[PDB]
Design a binder for this molecule. Structure first.
Ligand code: EIC
Ligand code: CO
Length: 121
């Protein structure tokens, strides 16, 4: 694993939009950090996390990878504790739902951590 840069993420966005044929109105929403509760959006988030090596469709969230991605300027073990709170089983047998659910969980108390991780260092 190697941490994804801002440039890496910008590429992964356009790749997922192209590969999944995401409509233009969704792209606009994503830009404004608006993620509708629908399968279009959930599969998009899964696609991005796949490319960033933060999520595997079978194994689920890749915890150590997430910690490295998120713990810049923070305590790694504190961040690991927060990540693990959001790690769950693939209850409803849907990788798209699964990836999105962890995303939603982590945003609740760690939004600024997410946003900080995707800005140029
Ligand atoms: C256990 C679950 C953990 C979930 C952690 C959440 C986020 C992962 C960390 C960094 C990746 C940034 C997400 C980019 C958002 C995609 C939408 C977009 O900007 O186009
Ligand atoms: Co950083």
């Amino acid at each position: 694993f190697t941490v994804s840069t801002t440039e890496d993420l910008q590429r992964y966005r356009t790749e997922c939009v192209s590969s999944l044929n995401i409509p233009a109105d969704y792209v606009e929403k994503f830009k404004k950090w608006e993620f509708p509760e629908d399968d279009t959006t959930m599969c998009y988030i899964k696609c991005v996390f796949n490319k960033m090596q933060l999520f595997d469709d079978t194994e689920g969230p890749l915890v150590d990878n997430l910690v490295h991605q998120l713990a810049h300027g923070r305590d790694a073990e504190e961040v690991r504790t927060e990540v693990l709170k959001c790690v769950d089983k693939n209850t409803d047998n849907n990788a798209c739902h699964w990836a999105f659910r962890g995303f939603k969980c982590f945003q609740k108390n760690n939004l600024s951590l997410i946003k900080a991780s995707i800005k140029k260092d």
